[PDB]
From Swiss-Prot:
Belongs to the protein-tyrosine phosphatase family. Non-receptor class 2 subfamily. Changing T71I: In NS1; also in Noonan patients manifesting juvenile myelomonocytic leukemia. This is Tyrosine-protein phosphatase non-receptor type 11. GO terms for molecular function: cadherin binding; cell adhesion molecule binding; insulin receptor binding; molecular adaptor activity; non-membrane spanning protein tyrosine phosphatase activity; peptide hormone receptor binding; phosphoprotein phosphatase activity; phosphotyrosine residue binding. The lineage of its organism: Eukaryota, Metazoa, Chordata, Craniata, Vertebrata. Changing T429M: In LPRD1; does not affect subcellular location; decreases protein tyrosine phosphatase activity against CDC73. Widely expressed, with highest levels in heart, brain, and skeletal muscle. Residues 4-96, 106-198 form the SH2 domain. Changing P452S: In NS1; increased phosphatase activity. InterPro entries: Prot-tyrosine_phosphatase-like, PTP_cat, SH2, SH2_dom_sf, Tyr_Pase_AS, Tyr_Pase_cat, Tyr_Pase_dom, Tyr_Pase_non-rcpt_typ-6/11. It comes from Homo sapiens. Substrate binds at D386, C420, S421, A422, G423, I424, G425, R426, Q467. PANTHER family: TYROSINE-PROTEIN PHOSPHATASE NON-RECEPTOR TYPE 11.
Length: 486
């Protein structure tokens, strides 16, 4: 679970919460108020509260006096298993759980009963349910059949929740979780199965502008993005291969690792431990490989991956050096030059500069086998800001449009390789826009798109794909711009 995350608390509320309801080792995380876009890990230690800053400009969660992580859940899980790592040590022993339901998928808050019935009727199925605010009370609305809608009243009596009888709960989450395991049974046999929360994020593509406007009001974008973040706790899949000793210096950031079930396994085999790259296959529902920026010691592994997967198009979404820091080593030769990267050979045939990007025409082949030669097109997006996202999606859209046609013109082309520094933020953003635009491209303006469903799907294949709310908003803005210029 991710109950240690409190989305609506100030730093003072967090101090009093940990001092009165926690013990030494109690902790919580929360979004920042003094610097929006940042986070605060508040820990109780020796009767006093320490506030540790977490920064995310779009690449990773950078914990102050700690490490870099793909998700807040991966960060908490790491310190809850590796003690003595956070510093004079700071121990994360006891999560202080959040009773606030704002980030619940099923919680809607302000929503009338007619709006809820209209939502459950037009968008629901058997087991679809939601919870809305009633004068301090709530209403649980559930659909049953193959059909009807039932309204269960949720009373708040002395800071506890109940449906009229039986158990009293500390939160609406604890009530929902209980009636999900132990369903309410109606008089004449109807089982109020709370199978899945009502989907309200799936929209018809033609209505993107209306949704963006609703999300822009005082912000709707923030609730939807934080609701999506609460679902990351379900994606703590194993990353054991990336943790192995012989693979540790093959990772740009030691805690941002590929999921074992989706990682690209290398078979070029130079015999003891030659099967690892910090990369993952991303399959929608065209494929992708989401990867980190090369290190000097992984350049050969990268070209072995490109060759093995039959990839013909690489999308690089970072400059090699940003803010004085190496983000990706130069893994391609200078123009007209030929270089050998282990058993692989690469010639840079031609470079073409465009306003936002540079295209490099590369020829890749295995040393000793000329018949293995294929052209690999490297699209190097150069104008993405050091922090945040572009103010207009036009540049990224024209770039993705070009990348798409190059990929479509190559018969039997393998997955498109996408990379930034950690391979999760700009990488996830570029891939999610390309997925949503591929839907609107094939199935026209009369199609159903679901931005958080698409992100959750890509996040189960690589940790923390799409890092910030600014990127998430950029995705909505990019889909919108694509649809408007159609
Ligand atoms: C107070 C707010 O009221 C509305 C609310 C925000 C928008 N809503 C919403 C619902 N579910 C998700 S995650 C998701 C979506 C679709 N497929 C999958 N697979 C996932 Cl994981 C999301 N990002 N936003 C409805 C709930 C908030 N509670």
């Amino acid at each position: 679970s991710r109950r240690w995350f409190h989305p609506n608390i100030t730093g003072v509320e967090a101090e009093n919460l940990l001092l009165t309801r926690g013990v030494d080792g109690s902790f919580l995380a929360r979004p920042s108020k003094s610097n929006p876009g940042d986070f605060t890990l508040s820990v109780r230690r020796n009767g006093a509260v320490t506030h540790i800053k977490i920064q995310n400009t779009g690449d990773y969660y950078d914990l102050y006096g700690g490490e870099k992580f793909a998700t807040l859940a991966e960060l908490v899980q790491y310190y809850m298993e590796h003690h003595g790592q956070l510093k004079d040590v700071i121990e994360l022993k006891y999560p202080l759980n959040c009773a606030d339901p704002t980030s619940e998928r099923w919680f809607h808050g302000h929503l009338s009963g007619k709006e809820a019935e209209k939502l459950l009727t037009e968008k629901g199925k058997h087991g679809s349910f939601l919870v809305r605010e009633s004068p301090g009370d709530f209403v649980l609305s559930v659909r049953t059949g193959d059909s009807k809608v039932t309204h269960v009243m949720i009373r708040c009596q002395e800071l506890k929740y109940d449906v009229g009888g039986g158990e009293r709960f500390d939160s609406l989450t604890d009530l929902v979780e209980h009636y999900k395991k132990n369903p309410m049974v109606e008089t004449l046999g109807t089982v109020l199965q709370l199978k899945q929360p009502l989907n309200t994020t799936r929209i018809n593509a033609a209505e993107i502008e209306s949704r963006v406007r609703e999300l822009s009001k005082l912000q709707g974008f923030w609730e939807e993005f934080e609701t999506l973040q609460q679902q990351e706790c379900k994606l703590l899949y194993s990353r054991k291969e990336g943790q192995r000793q012989e693979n540790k210096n093959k990772n740009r950031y030691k805690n941002i690792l590929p999921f074992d079930h989706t990682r690209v396994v290398l078979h070029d085999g130079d015999p003891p431990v030659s099967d690892y790259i910090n990369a993952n296959i991303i399959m929608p529902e065209k494929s992708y490989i989401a990867t980190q920026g090369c290190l000097q010691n992984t350049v050969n592994d990268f070209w072995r991956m490109v060759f093995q997967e039959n990839s013909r198009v690489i999308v690089m979404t970072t400059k090699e050096v940003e803010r004085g820091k190496s983000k990706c080593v130069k893994y391609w030769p200078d123009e007209y030059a030929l270089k050998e990267y282990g058993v692989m050979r690469v010639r840079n045939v031609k470079e073409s500069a465009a306003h936002d990007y540079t295209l490099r025409e590369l020829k890749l082949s295995k040393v000793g086998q000329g018949n293995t030669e294929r052209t690999v097109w490297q699209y190097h997006f150069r104008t993405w800001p050091d922090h945040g996202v572009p103010s207009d999606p036009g540049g990224v859209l024209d770039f993705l449009e070009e990348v798409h046609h190059k990929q479509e013109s190559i018969m039997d082309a393998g997955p498109v390789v996408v990379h930034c520094s950690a391979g999760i933020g700009r990488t996830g953003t570029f891939i999610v826009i390309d997925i949503l635009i591929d839907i609107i491209r094939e199935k026209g303006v009369d199609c159903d798109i679901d931005v958080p469903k698409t992100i959750q799907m890509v996040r189960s294949q690589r940790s923390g794909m799409v890092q910030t709310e600014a990127q998430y908003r950029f995705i909505y803005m990019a889909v919108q711009h694509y649809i408007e210029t159609l």
